[PDB]
Ligand SMILES: CC(C)(COP(=O)(O)OP(=O)(O)OC[C@H]1O[C@@H](n2cnc3c(N)ncnc32)[C@H](O)[C@@H]1OP(=O)(O)O)[C@@H](O)C(=O)NCCC(=O)NCCS
């Protein structure tokens with residue numbers, strides 16, 4: 397009698413191996429897989445069951461409002477209490493790639509921003525980030541995930557950038573909830589670095605902290621830590637600023653050569669609470 401652990405999930409054409417344990421309310425059996433519908437995120441212990449439900453009429457994108465949509469990606473705003481089942485299913489899936497996450501069942505306190513790539517085949521959920529409706533610490537991101545099959549493609553950077561666009565529209569500075577996983581922190585540092593580097597070449601050669609905070613919603617702390625790592629912290633005309641140098645132009649051109657996608661602030665049609 398084999399009592400196996402969840403060693404792989406079937407999502408679309410991908411067979412994915414979990415990084416961490418997730419509290420799926422499933423029976424332990426001699427099999428080590430479950431099916432995860434790439435639309436409803438619902439889980440099944442048998443291909444047959446998955447099949448039965450695949451046939452039923454359902455939307456082909458996240459159950460939320462599409463508040464951002466460009467030729468590359470779309471962002472859907474989902475309210476936990478308004479879509480408990482779907483969101484609980486999203487947290488269960490997310491917990492497979494996070495060392496720690498709050499009780500997946502309690503989704504009412506969060507707002508979920510899900511990102512999709514649109515193909516001739518429709519919407520494909522590639523990542524998302526959650527956010528506390530009310531955060532005592534002003535965190536603008538609770539948990540953030542790029543589905544593993546789509547990692548290392550720039551989507552995570554898009555997710556972080558979008559989270560900052562909400563904060564800008566909200567007229568508040570924000571920072572991701574601490575502590576961060578090594579993966580998340582390295583993604584954030586790359587993002588903070590690319591942002592200051594782009595601001596210094598496309599906006600102004602010298603920028604004060606307030607100006608950077610105003611244009612990016614980044615916190616003083618994250619701005620200063622980033623400016624120090626790049627060695628661009630200086631004092632000019634009475635206040636601390638970040639300045640442009642040769643290394644920056646170089647890094648910028650390299651970044652640009654990578655021809656990456658970004659978030660167009662003008663395409664965010666959204667009003668904060
Ligand atoms: C942290 C996380 C969101 C990052 O997401 P991601 O989709 O991999 O992020 P990005 O792709 O934007 O990261 C940029 C990296 O992708 C690489 N990349 C992007 N497009 C590429 C392409 N076409 N060819 C080669 N590399 C590419 C970048 O070069 C960069 O590599 P580097 O980090 O060594 O410099 C993801 O690892 C994740 O969901 N992890 C599990 C959850 C977690 O730890 N969350 C943080 C807790 S708050």
Ligand code: NA
Pocket residue numbers: 537538539540572573575576577580
């Ligand atoms: Na996080």
